Amino acid sequence: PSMRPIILVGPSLKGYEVTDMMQKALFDFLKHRFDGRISITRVTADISLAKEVQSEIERIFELARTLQLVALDADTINHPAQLSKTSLAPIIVYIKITSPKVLQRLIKSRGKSQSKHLNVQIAASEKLAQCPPEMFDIILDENQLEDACEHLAEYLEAYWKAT
Amino acid sequence: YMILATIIANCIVLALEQHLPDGDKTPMSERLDDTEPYFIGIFCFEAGIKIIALGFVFHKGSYLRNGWNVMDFVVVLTGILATAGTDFDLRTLRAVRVLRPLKLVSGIPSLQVVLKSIMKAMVPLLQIGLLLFFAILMFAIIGLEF
Amino acid sequence: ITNFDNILFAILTVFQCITMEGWTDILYNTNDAAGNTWNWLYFIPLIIIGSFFMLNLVLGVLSGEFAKERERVENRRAFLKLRRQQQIERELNGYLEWIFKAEEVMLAEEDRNSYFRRKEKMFRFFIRRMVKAQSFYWVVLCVVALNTLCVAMVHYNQPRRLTTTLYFAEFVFLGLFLTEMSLKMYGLGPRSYFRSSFNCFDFGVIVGSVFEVVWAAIKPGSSFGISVLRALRLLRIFKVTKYWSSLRNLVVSLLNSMKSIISLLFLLFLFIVVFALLGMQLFGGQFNFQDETPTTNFDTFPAAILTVFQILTGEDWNAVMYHGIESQGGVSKGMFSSFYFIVLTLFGNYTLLNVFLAIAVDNLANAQELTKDEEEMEEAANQKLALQKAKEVAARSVWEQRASQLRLQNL
Amino acid sequence: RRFCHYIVTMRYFEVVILVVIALSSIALAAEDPVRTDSPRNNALKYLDYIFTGVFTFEMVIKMIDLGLLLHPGAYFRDLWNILDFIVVSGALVAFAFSGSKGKDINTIKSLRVLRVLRPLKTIKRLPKLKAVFDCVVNSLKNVLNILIVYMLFMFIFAVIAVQLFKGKFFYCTDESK
Amino acid sequence: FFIYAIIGMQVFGNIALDDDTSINRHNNFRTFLQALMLLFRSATGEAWHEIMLSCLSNQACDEQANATECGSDFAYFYFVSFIFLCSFLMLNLFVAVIMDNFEYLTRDSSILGPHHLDEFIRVWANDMFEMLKHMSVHFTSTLMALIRTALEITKQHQCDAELRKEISVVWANLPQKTLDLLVPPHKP
Amino acid sequence: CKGKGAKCSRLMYDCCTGSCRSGKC
Amino acid sequence: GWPMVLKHSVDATYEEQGPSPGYRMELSIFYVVYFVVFPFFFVNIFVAL
Ligand SMILES: CC(C)CCC[C@@H](C)[C@H]1CC[C@H]2[C@@H]3CC=C4C[C@@H](OC(=O)CCC(=O)O)CC[C@]4(C)[C@H]3CC[C@]12C
Ligand SMILES: CC(C)CCC[C@@H](C)[C@H]1CC[C@H]2[C@@H]3CC=C4C[C@@H](OC(=O)CCC(=O)O)CC[C@]4(C)[C@H]3CC[C@]12C
Numbered sequence A: 001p002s003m004r005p006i007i008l009v010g011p012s013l014k015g016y017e018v019t020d021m022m023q024k025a026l027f028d029f030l031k032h033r034f035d036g037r038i039s040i041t042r043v044t045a046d047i048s049l050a051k052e053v054q055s056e057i058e059r060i061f062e063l064a065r066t067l068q069l070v071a072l073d074a075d076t077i078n079h080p081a082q083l084s085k086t087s088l089a090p091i092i093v094y095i096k097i098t099s100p101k102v103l104q105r106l107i108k109s110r111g112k113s114q115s116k117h118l119n120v121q122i123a124a125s126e127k128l129a130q131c132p133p134e135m136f137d138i139i140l141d142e143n144q145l146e147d148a149c150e151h152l153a154e155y156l157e158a159y160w161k162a163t
Numbered sequence B: 001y002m003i004l005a006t007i008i009a010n011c012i013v014l015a016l017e018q019h020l021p022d023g024d025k026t027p028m029s030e031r032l033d034d035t036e037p038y039f040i041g042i043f044c045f046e047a048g049i050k051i052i053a054l055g056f057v058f059h060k061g062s063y064l065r066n067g068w069n070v071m072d073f074v075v076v077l078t079g080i081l082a083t084a085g086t087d088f089d090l091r092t093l094r095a096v097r098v099l100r101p102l103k104l105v106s107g108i109p110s111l112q113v114v115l116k117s118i119m120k121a122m123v124p125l126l127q128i129g130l131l132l133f134f135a136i137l138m139f140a141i142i143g144l145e146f
Numbered sequence C: 001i002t003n004f005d006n007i008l009f010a011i012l013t014v015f016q017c018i019t020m021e022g023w024t025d026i027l028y029n030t031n032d033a034a035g036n037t038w039n040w041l042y043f044i045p046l047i048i049i050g051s052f053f054m055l056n057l058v059l060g061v062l063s064g065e066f067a068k069e070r071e072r073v074e075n076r077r078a079f080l081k082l083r084r085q086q087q088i089e090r091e092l093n094g095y096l097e098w099i100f101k102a103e104e105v106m107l108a109e110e111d112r113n114s115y116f117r118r119k120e121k122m123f124r125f126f127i128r129r130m131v132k133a134q135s136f137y138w139v140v141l142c143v144v145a146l147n148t149l150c151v152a153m154v155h156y157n158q159p160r161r162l163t164t165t166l167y168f169a170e171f172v173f174l175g176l177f178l179t180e181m182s183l184k185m186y187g188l189g190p191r192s193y194f195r196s197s198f199n200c201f202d203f204g205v206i207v208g209s210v211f212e213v214v215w216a217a218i219k220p221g222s223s224f225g226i227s228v229l230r231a232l233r234l235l236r237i238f239k240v241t242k243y244w245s246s247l248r249n250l251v252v253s254l255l256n257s258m259k260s261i262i263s264l265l266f267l268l269f270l271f272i273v274v275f276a277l278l279g280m281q282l283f284g285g286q287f288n289f290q291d292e293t294p295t296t297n298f299d300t301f302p303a304a305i306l307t308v309f310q311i312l313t314g315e316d317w318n319a320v321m322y323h324g325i326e327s328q329g330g331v332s333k334g335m336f337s338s339f340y341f342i343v344l345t346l347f348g349n350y351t352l353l354n355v356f357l358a359i360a361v362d363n364l365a366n367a368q369e370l371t372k373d374e375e376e377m378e379e380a381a382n383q384k385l386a387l388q389k390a391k392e393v394a395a396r397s398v399w400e401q402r403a404s405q406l407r408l409q410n411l
Numbered sequence D: 001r002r003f004c005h006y007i008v009t010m011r012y013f014e015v016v017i018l019v020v021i022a023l024s025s026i027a028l029a030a031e032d033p034v035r036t037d038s039p040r041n042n043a044l045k046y047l048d049y050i051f052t053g054v055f056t057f058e059m060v061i062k063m064i065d066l067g068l069l070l071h072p073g074a075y076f077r078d079l080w081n082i083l084d085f086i087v088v089s090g091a092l093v094a095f096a097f098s099g100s101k102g103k104d105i106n107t108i109k110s111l112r113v114l115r116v117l118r119p120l121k122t123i124k125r126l127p128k129l130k131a132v133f134d135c136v137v138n139s140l141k142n143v144l145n146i147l148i149v150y151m152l153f154m155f156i157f158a159v160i161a162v163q164l165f166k167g168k169f170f171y172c173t174d175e176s177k
Numbered sequence E: 001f002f003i004y005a006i007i008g009m010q011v012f013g014n015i016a017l018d019d020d021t022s023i024n025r026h027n028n029f030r031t032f033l034q035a036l037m038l039l040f041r042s043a044t045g046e047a048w049h050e051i052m053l054s055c056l057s058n059q060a061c062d063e064q065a066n067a068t069e070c071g072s073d074f075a076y077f078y079f080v081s082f083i084f085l086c087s088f089l090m091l092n093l094f095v096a097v098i099m100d101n102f103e104y105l106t107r108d109s110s111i112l113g114p115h116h117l118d119e120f121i122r123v124w125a126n127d128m129f130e131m132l133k134h135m136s137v138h139f140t141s142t143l144m145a146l147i148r149t150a151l152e153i154t155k156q157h158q159c160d161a162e163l164r165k166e167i168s169v170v171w172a173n174l175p176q177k178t179l180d181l182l183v184p185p186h187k188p
Numbered sequence F: 001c002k003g004k005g006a007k008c009s010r011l012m013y014d015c016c017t018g019s020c021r022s023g024k025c
Numbered sequence G: 001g002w003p004m005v006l007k008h009s010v011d012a013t014y015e016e017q018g019p020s021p022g023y024r025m026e027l028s029i030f031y032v033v034y035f036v037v038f039p040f041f042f043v044n045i046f047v048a049l
């Protein structure tokens, strides 16, 4: 695409309340911060199969044609390696939970349905942590919403200046 | 836990005693002195259990090889000796009955840990004790002179 | 008893001067017996070299021992765990802030399109921003300071208009604080309200205030003095200063080691009990020779324990020693009962200092390394964050220095 | 004349002022409180007149050199200068009111007590004593955040003590009424 | 002590010496030495509150004192302020003397220090073997070498460079060869 | 409560307006 | 002079009433709790700090 689409890898597998809400908070900060400069869309199709799936690829290029910032809410993308072999060349921003047990307490905090599944979430966090820093275009190991939002917004301002 | 219960009951019985000037006695004092053999029997019972289950000195781990169990043995032995029918036993063998609150420490290991934490910082204070006694002695000699 | 007629009597009087208890009674006695021109040379050097220089020596040795204990492998491990959990608590607070903002915006976008539950949750979330704003905090502080002002004008013979005014003001302030507690419950939940140590204390003080109001309704005279504890909420003023970190960490260390502070104050109680029982054994029912029994007698157990406590505080321990010497005979033959008080004021004025200085040094230091480590990790994280974000766009006290050196040596 | 006032402040004036302060402190130690009409008190009153004159002279020297309060780095910019004003002005005001008229009594004793700040000049005139004072003040600032907590806790305890014992500490001379 | 003694003399000097009060013939403010003794008595906390009450307003004045009304309610501030000022200054003195020796109060037996150097001086009475059997360019060089063994700051040349840097840092007060003498002794 | 100058005992503390010093209030 | 204040505190009966010796010995805990806090703990906080 003209500019790399914004896909965020969450601390744990997507579709779970912890990652869902944290990623959604970042999404909504972006939609307020870059209003008139950014585009946020849902991507339900499995774009890790890229090389219905092909139709969403051309759509991703289409929203990126007009030099508007494009944000993909890809539900199936839970690891940067899923987008290494695609032609999308996305921007990878990693919401990093620096220590595991705070993430454990986070998950146990979300009601009692989220508490049912945990091992998948820790293994997701560890698997995403094993990844090299270079793969993650922007790292978010912060704990404050203002800090992480300002970091990502500053990086996107620099990237827009690049475009 | 029942030993700790009897120790606490014994502390309450000791705190319930009241002394009167010239041989007078509160009516409750007779009851609090008739409740003594129960505590003596229970303490001697645990002493017997810990002496037959463990050794005495020979195993190098035993009753009399633990400093805290030596205090328990002294307390129970003097309690036994407090009914010997002699004339001079009352003034002293009933004055070692005051160490039974310390059986709480002797039974609760965390209290022993905290007590060691207290008393290990007071070992370097013995040199201050020697200095204090030397100063006290020198000033006492000067006061004798003057 | 206070004479230099012998080396034992001289040692007893000198030791009683060392404890600075009635050391001027003896000085005045030697000012009447002899001239007063030279007697200060015996006693003021005595006080300086026995009670001020030796107390300095004791404090120095104890502080050195506490410093050496602090930088030891097991205590170092315990402090490392404490700092780890404080770090994780801060991280969890930040992440829960992320999730709360997200849940708020999700609720907003769901409502812009179960209605009763949605409205209830939206009202709860509005309260939750309300109970965390920097305006509710100042309103609560102003209410507390008005409640502190009311209890501070309660004097004797206050105007009969003031008594009823403060009665109705107590009821009004209780209503306001129940309102605040309920609002914080609703916005935060019992699971998260009691996470804060101050909130648990306030809840306890609200319960105590309600209990005291009910009790005063039952008995219109009694006053437990528990509603005054709402003045400790004025400590929240430190939240808007730079002193918040050190005091919060001091309270955190106190709470963490409270299982070792309760156990410490129980050994003091056990030793006070042992000395009270021994005092009843030795001087029980024998302080009646003066033709009246003193207030500090050893007859009953409350009286014995109060006498032992007063000797521990070191006030008029020499007077109790004189009375206990005369109770057992006199200066002629009862002077070997002065070892009870000597032992109780040596092993009671130095174990009190040992225990309470251990508590104070340990917890104050733990606070110091906690706040210093959190400041240093804040700045280190900021600088690492700078040098990583810019990557992708293209003195100390002698105690702290010695503690670092001790940590190096023990490593 | 300001160069003259400057050189007067540097012609070994500090040691002379220190000697004056020390001698005046000794004079304060020598006064007799119980016998206000003693001849020794009269001699020390004349000595205090001399010392007040010396301090007023130093005071006006510093007036001319530093300037009262206008610019930075001048007089009244250091609290020691205000303390010097307090000492000198109190002595002069007491001297003016010491007309031996008998109209007022309680004021003259307070203005004489105002002299005791005289030794506190040396704490600035000696740099090492000033360093020790600054260390003490730094300690007081270090424990100031715990002094406020201490005073608050003692305030709750004092209010509880009032509520417990307000109006109850009364007694008769006889223990039966 | 001096300032408070003078204040006590001026304000509280003419109170009448009654033996049933706490302003005795032993404990008066009537002279500098007596006022200073009273201050030292209150510094040690010896019934200072009774003195304060004996110094309050409306006390009997002395027979040879011109003023009929003697004593003032300033005694509250006087005695309270003296008590905590003296306590604070004395505690500051205590802490200053404590931290002036904190490397000795926290001293650990294993790590070598001034005691080691005093022991080596006593060694003067070969003997190095016996001393090391009793232990935790003639003698000063051996002192420097044994201090090197005590704590580590080829590796020998790097330590020599460290010692030369230290010598440059702490070059003595116009010494011809004193630190350079140590360097010639630090060569081995 | 013993008046001023009354014979008292130190440990009694019944020495209203003062303290028992040298056996006298 | 803290034990004399303790004696006056316990003996205190009611507002505008004279003392009754021995009355209200439960109010010895106010002074025990006060000593545990200020003379013992807070003063040691100052010393340690
Ligand atoms: C205001 C909050 C933050 C605490 C700060 C405490 C003090 C600044 C204020 C609070 C109310 C004031 C008190 C209100 C009423 C009394 C009783 C009053 O005594 C009398 O009036 C004589 C008796 C009578 O006839 O009424 C003397 C002032 C005093 C102590 C005041 C002293 C100063 C006080 C304690
Ligand atoms: C080196 C520094 C610390 C100075 C030492 C402290 C001085 C400020 C103090 C210490 C004792 C004081 C003296 C205490 C007794 C008096 C008696 C007074 O004269 C008398 O002897 C009274 C009888 C009479 O003259 O009628 C003269 C001042 C003087 C010597 C004081 C002068 C100031 C002194 C020396």
Ligand SMILES: CCCCCCCCCCCCCCCC
Residues within 6 Å of the ligand: C006, C008, C009, C011, C012, C331, C332, C335, C336, C338
């Ligand atoms: C270390 C303190 C010891 C205190 C004991 C003092 C005992 C002195 C009394 C025995 C000497 C005979 C006195 C008979 C005449 C007064």
Ligand SMILES: CCCCCCCCCCCCCCCC
Residues within 6 Å of the ligand: B142, B146, C034, C035, C038, C039, C041, C042, C045, C046
């Ligand atoms: C002749 C008068 C009788 C009383 C004399 C007492 C004077 C005391 C002598 C000095 C001792 C000072 C203590 C030693 C350490 C400074």
Ligand SMILES: CCCCCCCCCCCCCCCC
Residues within 6 Å of the ligand: C265, C268, C269, C272, C302, C305, C306, C309, G025, G026, G028, G029, G032, G036
């Ligand atoms: C850390 C010190 C703890 C000391 C606890 C005991 C002190 C004395 C308590 C006195 C209680 C008197 C109650 C009277 C009941 C009739």
Ligand SMILES: CCCCCCCCCCCCCCCC
Residues within 6 Å of the ligand: C282, C328, C329, C333, C334, C335, C336, C337, C338, C339, C340, C343
């Ligand atoms: C911690 C040990 C304290 C032991 C105290 C010993 C006191 C014994 C009494 C002194 C002799 C009294 C003689 C007359 C008895 C009626």
Ligand SMILES: CCCCCCCCCCCCCCCC
Residues within 6 Å of the ligand: D079, D080, D083, E003, E007, E077, E078, E081
């Ligand atoms: C940095 C300048 C500070 C200004 C002066 C401070 C003086 C502090 C004096 C404290 C004690 C004086 C005596 C108090 C008399 C009641």
Ligand SMILES: CCCCCCCCCCCCCCCC
Residues within 6 Å of the ligand: E057, E071, E072, E073, E074, E077
């Ligand atoms: C007859 C005496 C009436 C009361 C006179 C003094 C009142 C209290 C003065 C307190 C001064 C405090 C501040 C001065 C030092 C900073």
Ligand SMILES: CCCCCCCCCCCCCCCC
Residues within 6 Å of the ligand: E073, E074, E076, E077, E080, E081
């Ligand atoms: C008997 C009339 C009431 C007392 C009048 C004067 C008040 C006392 C002066 C206030 C001094 C406060 C002391 C604070 C010390 C830090």
Ligand SMILES: CCCCCCCCCCCCCCCC
Residues within 6 Å of the ligand: D140, D143, E084, E085, E087, E088, E091, G043, G046, G047
């Ligand atoms: C302006 C000063 C306010 C007071 C601050 C500290 C006072 C309390 C210090 C008490 C220390 C006494 C020595 C150590 C006793 C264990």
Ligand SMILES: CCCCCCCCCCCCCCCC
Residues within 6 Å of the ligand: C224, D153, D160, G026, G027, G029, G030, G033
């Ligand atoms: C019979 C009712 C009164 C019971 C004894 C006094 C109870 C109050 C003790 C202290 C309460 C305040 C604690 C403050 C701790 C920071």
Ligand SMILES: [Ca+2]
Residues within 6 Å of the ligand: C021, C022, C314, C315, C316, E045, E046, E047, G001
């Ligand atoms: Ca005393």
